[PDB]
Amino acid sequence: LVHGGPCDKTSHPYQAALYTSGHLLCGGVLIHPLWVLTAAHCKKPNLQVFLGKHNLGQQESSQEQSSVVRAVIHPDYDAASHDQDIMLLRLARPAKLSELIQPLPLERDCSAQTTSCHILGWGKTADGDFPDTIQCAYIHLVSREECEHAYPGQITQNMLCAGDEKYGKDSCQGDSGGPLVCGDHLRGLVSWGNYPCGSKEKPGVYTNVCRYTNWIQKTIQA
Ligand SMILES: N=C(N)c1ccc([C@@H]2Cc3ccccc3B(O)O2)cc1
Numbered sequence: 761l762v763h764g765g766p767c768d769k770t771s772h773p774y775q776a777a778l779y780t781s782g783h784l785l786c787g788g789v790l791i792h793p794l795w796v797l798t799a800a801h802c803k804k805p806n807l808q809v810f811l812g813k814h815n816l817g818q819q820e821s822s823q824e825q826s827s828v829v830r831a832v833i834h835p836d837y838d839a840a841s842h843d844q845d846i847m848l849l850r851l852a853r854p855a856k857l858s859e860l861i862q863p864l865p866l867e868r869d870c871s872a873q874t875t876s877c878h879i880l881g882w883g884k885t886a887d888g889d890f891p892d893t894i895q896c897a898y899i900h901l902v903s904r905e906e907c908e909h910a911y912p913g914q915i916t917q918n919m920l921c922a923g924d925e926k927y928g929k930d931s932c933q934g935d936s937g938g939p940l941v942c943g944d945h946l947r948g949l950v951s952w953g954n955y956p957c958g959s960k961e962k963p964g965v966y967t968n969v970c971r972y973t974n975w976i977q978k979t980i981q982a
Contacts, residue, residue, distance in 0.1 A: 761879060761935055761941065762886050762957045763927045764897035769814045769843065770910045772880055773865035774946075777810040784816065784890065787881040787938025789946055791839065792980060796849040798937030799967065800837040807831065808843060808852060812861045814881055817892035822860040827852040827965050832979050834972070843916050845951045845967045847937070848979050867945040870970040875901045877922055877942040879964075883934030884957060890934060897929040899909025901942070902963040910954075910962040920948045920966040931964045932957035932974060940966045 776788030776796045786802035788809060796809050812822040830850040837844045855861055880896045899922045907921035915921070922931060923949055931938065931950040940948030948966030953959070 761881050761895040761897055761930070762932050763929045764885075764895040765791050765847055766878055767814070767894045767896040770860065771896070772802070772814075773812070773815070773860050773862035773893065774939065775880060777813050777816065777882060779810065780804040780806065780809040784882055784934055784935070784938045787883070787931065787950060789939045789949070790855060790861070791866060791946065791976070792863055793854040793857065794851050794981060796851065797946070797976070798847050798849060799845045799951055800833045800847040801839065801842070801845055801951075802937045803831055803833060803847060804947065809849060811855050813894070815893050824856055824861060826855070834975060841916070842919070842952045842965070844918050846949060846972055848976065858896060864939065864941070864946045865944070866973070866976070867942065867947045867970050868973050870968075872943070872947070872970070875941040877901060877947060878938055879929075879931050879935070879938065879940055880920070881931065881935030881938040883932040883936070885932075893949065897922050897924070899959070899964070907963055907965070911965070913964070914974050918971055919951065920968045921963040922948070922966060923963035925960060927963065928958035928960035930954070930957045930959040
């Protein structure tokens with residue numbers, strides 16, 4: 761996350777860290793003791809999910825670990841266009857809940873007009889380095905028209921755009937699958953965006969979670 765700052769250790773209990781080959785690949789969202797919601801482009805071999813983490817460089821008393829039993833990619837995910845970029849991860853071991861491990865409620869209502877959001881993760885910071893401490897930033901939901909102009913013919917109804925014209929607060933490499941939180945509900949998933957990271961002109965693109973209400977439930981019920 762570029763142009764943000766360290767999160768408060770207690771303000772992100774739903775945050776997941778996804779590892780592959782000994783390094784952080786993506787973020788994720790705990791939405792159920794058995795399920796982490798992430799981006800479909802985060803599918804990599806032998807994913808290890810870490811819950812209750814704040815500082816990646818140190819073993820913490822609150823952290824929990826789990827292998828993936830089943831990675832469920834949306835049937836209509838299109839890798840070339842990033843459309844329907846959502847994946848459900850079934851945890852091998854259900855998450856042991858505490859004050860630092862809790863699921864985030866999803867936004868079911870597509871009509872919701874809360875523009876004031878926040879992003880978080882352990883992705884590349886302004887200096888081009890990967891932080892050990894989780895980063896936060898307040899960003900705003902950009903218009904469909906503004907996004908459509910920034911990325912011609914690449915924005916679908918399954919995508920949301922959020923940024924900050926003021927300082928260019930954006931998600932970055934390593935923040936993918938992570939949350940876009942609006943009104944203490946999951947509004948989006950870090951999907952893709954401008955390179956180098958920065959939303960001063962071209963906003964960050966997020967999977968639009970409200971559209972997947974039915975598929976999520978149907979997957980968890982299976
Ligand atoms: N809004 C942006 N500027 C933005 C955010 C996240 C990404 C990557 C995409 C990715 C690809 C492959 C593996 C992981 C990721 B991810 O963590 O972030 C790229 C751009």
